């Protein structure tokens, strides 16, 4: 079990002003640390944030947090469930800022809600350094769905933070799961919500990406294929070719006729194209969403290689290609579940 710690700096808060926090399970025997970012959509104005506070309050407040949590998937300490890092120090950071982990604005007299996602990550890292992280050799920042996008937005800031604090020996890396989206046409009549959210949250994006797209076009950096080339920390990308959250924003809900068949096939081809210059990636041809913290994450394979194996090969590569231990795994067949190992 992972144990809850509320942030000692109570000014770094969830949406409603309650303190943010993290769940931790230590492993004194390891110098590897895994920090995982929870997902769960977002809210972008007063009215729909008010709605989210009524029926999704745990994503906006720490008031009702359970006092511990169970680690699953890549957060499991059992070798049978987690062949990759079962012996690592485990950290689960709850998502209570509703800002895709980008915000840096406090609750105040002008702001009904606080959006502090980027600052929550910074403060968790700082408080963990007095608690074991100062001796780490690798810090892997991971996350799923909105947390996967949060990895892309924050991994280089964590690297910069550790350098400025005096810890240049810690190798910061990222693992972005199911947060690699496309700003494509919908099947029937979404990027505007991101643009409005950024101004509502005072959201921040990586500096190298911001300099490319410049004022008021910062929404571009929320899309993986645009922000990834600007990052300097090593990042491993996991993405279903037919992601269910992507299809939902595209207004696709699953007899498929020719128009829909061509749309679905073109989406898989476009996603595959955006990953050709991404050396560390895992992209199976399945209709699903999220992967790395479910208990049976070991079952899916691309070209005969599991995701835990591909991540271990990634570790080895960062000590050119390795014999029988690949890191770039993208299916080429064109329809959902043409890979026999897709989840049911
Ligand atoms: C849950 O996370 C998101 O909603 C998200 C994150 C980053 C970028 C986009 C996002 O939603 C989308 C907006 C528009 C289109 N076309 C696709 C996806
Ligand atoms: C708490 O965090 C905020 C935001 O990062 C910072 O401005 C403040 O100085 C911190 N408080 C202390 C006591 O360090």
Three-state SS for the chain is CEEEEECCCCCCECCCCCECEEEEECCCCCCEEEEEECCCCCCCCHHHHHHHHHHCHHHCCCCCCCCEECCCHHHCCCCCCCCCCCCCEEEEECCCCCCCCCCCECCCCCCCCCECHHHHHHHHHHHHHCCCHHHCCEEEEEEECHHHHHHHHHHHHHHHHHHHHCCCCCEEEEEEECCCCCCCCCCCCCHHHHHHHHHHHCCCCCHHHHHHHCCCCHHHHHCHHHHHHHCCCCEEEECCCEEHHHHHHCCCCCCCCHHHHHHHHHHHHHHHHHCCCCCCEEECCCEECCCCCCCCCCCCEECCEEHHHHHHHHHHHCCCCCCCCCCEEECCCCCCCCCCCCCC
**Annotated catalytic residue, options 144, 145, 178, 288:** 145
In angstroms, the CA 95 to CA 58 distance is 8
> Which residue among 43, 147, 180, 190 is best mutated to probe the pocket of ligand 1, counting the most ligand atoms within 8 A of its Cβ?
190
Question: Method used for this model?
Answer: X-ray
Asked if residue 152 has its Cβ within 6 Å of ligand 2, the reply is no
Name every protein residue with a CB atom under 6 angstroms from any ligand 1 atom: 41, 100, 145-146, 149, 181, 183-184, 190-191, 194, 222-223, 245-246, 249
Taken in order 276, 181, 206, 220, the sign of the CA dihedral is positive
Please tell me the distance between residue 11's alpha carbon and the centre of ligand 2 in angstroms: 7
145 catalytically annotated: yes
Which residue, among 24, 19, 34, has the nearest Cα to 3 in the 3D structure? 24
In angstroms, the CA 312 to CA 314 distance is 5
In angstroms, the CA 173 to CA 178 distance is 17
Asked if residue 10 has its Cβ within 6 Å of ligand 2, the reply is no
In angstroms, the CA 52 to CA 38 distance is 16
Residues 219, 195 contacting (CB under 8 angstroms): yes
Which residues lie below 8 Å from residue 310, measured CB to CB, with a gap of 6+?
Answer: 236, 280, 282, 302, 326, 327, 329
In angstroms, the CA 291 to CA 75 distance is 12
Residues 291, 177 contacting (CB under 8 angstroms): yes
Residues 151, 235 contacting (CB under 8 angstroms): yes
- Note the Cα 303 to chain centre separation in Å: 24
Which residues lie below 8 Å from residue 50, measured CB to CB, with a gap of 6+?
Answer: none
Which residues lie below 8 Å from residue 98, measured CB to CB, with a gap of 6+?
Answer: 15, 41, 42, 43, 49, 52, 59, 60, 113, 115
Phi, psi of 310 (to 5 degrees): -60, -40
In angstroms, the CA 199 to CA 137 distance is 37
64 catalytically annotated: no
Which residue, among 130, 117, 120, 331, has the nearest Cα to 240 in the 3D structure? 331
Breaks (C-N over 2.5 A) in the chain follow: 189, 254, 319
Query: How does 272-310 read in b/e, with b if 16+ C-beta sit within 10 Å?
Result: bebbeebbbbbbbbbbbbbbbbeeebbebbbeebbbbbb
**Annotated catalytic residue, options 281, 289, 328, 331:** 289
User: Domain residues of the chain, as ranges?
Assistant: 1-344
Ligand nearest 10 Cα, by number? 2
Asked if residue 7 has its Cβ within 6 Å of ligand 2, the reply is no
Please tell me the distance between residue 97's alpha carbon and the centre of ligand 1 in angstroms: 17
Residues 103, 117 contacting (CB under 8 angstroms): yes
In angstroms, the CA 147 to CA 136 distance is 23
Which residue, among 13, 5, 2, has the nearest Cα to 131 in the 3D structure? 5
Q: How far is CA 81 from CA 49, 87, 340, in A?
A: 37, 12, 21
> Nearest 5 degrees, angle CA 96-CA 98-CA 99?
120
30 catalytically annotated: no
**Annotated catalytic residue, options 243, 250, 315, 331:** 243
Which residues lie below 8 Å from residue 154, measured CB to CB, with a gap of 6+?
Answer: 101, 118, 121, 141
């Amino acid at each position: 079990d992972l144990r809850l710690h509320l942030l000692l700096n109570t000014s770094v808060t969830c949406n409603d002003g309650s303190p943010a926090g993290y769940y931790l399970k230590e492993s004194r025997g390891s110098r590897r640390w895994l920090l995982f970012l929870e997902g769960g959509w977002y809210c972008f104005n007063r009215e729909n944030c008010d709605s989210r506070y009524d029926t999704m309050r745990r994503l906006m407040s720490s008031r009702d947090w359970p006092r511990t949590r169970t680690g699953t998937g890549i957060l499991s300490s059992q070798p049978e469930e987690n062949p990759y890092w079962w012996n690592a120090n485990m950290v689960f950071i709850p998502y209570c800022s509703s800002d895709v982990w980008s915000g840096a604005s406090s609750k105040s007299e002008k702001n009904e809600y606080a959006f502090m996602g980027a600052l929550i990550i910074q403060e968790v890292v700082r408080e963990l350094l007095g608690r074991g992280l100062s001796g780490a050799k690798v810090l892997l920042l991971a996350g799923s769905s909105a947390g996967g996008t949060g990895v892309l937005l924050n991994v280089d800031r964590v690297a910069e933070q550790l350098e400025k604090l005096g810890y240049p020996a810690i190798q910061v890396r990222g693992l972005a799961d199911s947060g690699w989206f496309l700003d494509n046409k919908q099947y029937r009549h979404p990027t505007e919500a991101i643009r409005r959210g950024i101004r509502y949250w005072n959201g921040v994006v990586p500096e190298r990406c911001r300099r490319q797209f410049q004022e008021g076009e910062e929404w571009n950096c929320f899309f993986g294929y645009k922000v990834y080339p600007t990052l300097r920390s090593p990042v491993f990308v996991v993405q279903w070719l037919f992601d269910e959250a992507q299809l939902t924003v595209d207004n696709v809900h699953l007899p498929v006729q020719e128009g829909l068949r061509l749309y679905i096939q073109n989406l898989g081809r476009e996603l595959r194209h955006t990953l050709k210059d991404v050396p560390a990636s895992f992209a199976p041809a399945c209709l699903s969403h999220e992967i790395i913290i479910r208990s049976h994450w070991t079952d899916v394979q691309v070209k005969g290689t599991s995701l835990p194996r591909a991540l271990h090969c990634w570790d080895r590569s960062l000590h050119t290609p390795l014999k029988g231990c690949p890191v770039h795994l993208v299916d080429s067949c064109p329809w959902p579940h043409c890979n026999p190992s897709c989840p049911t």
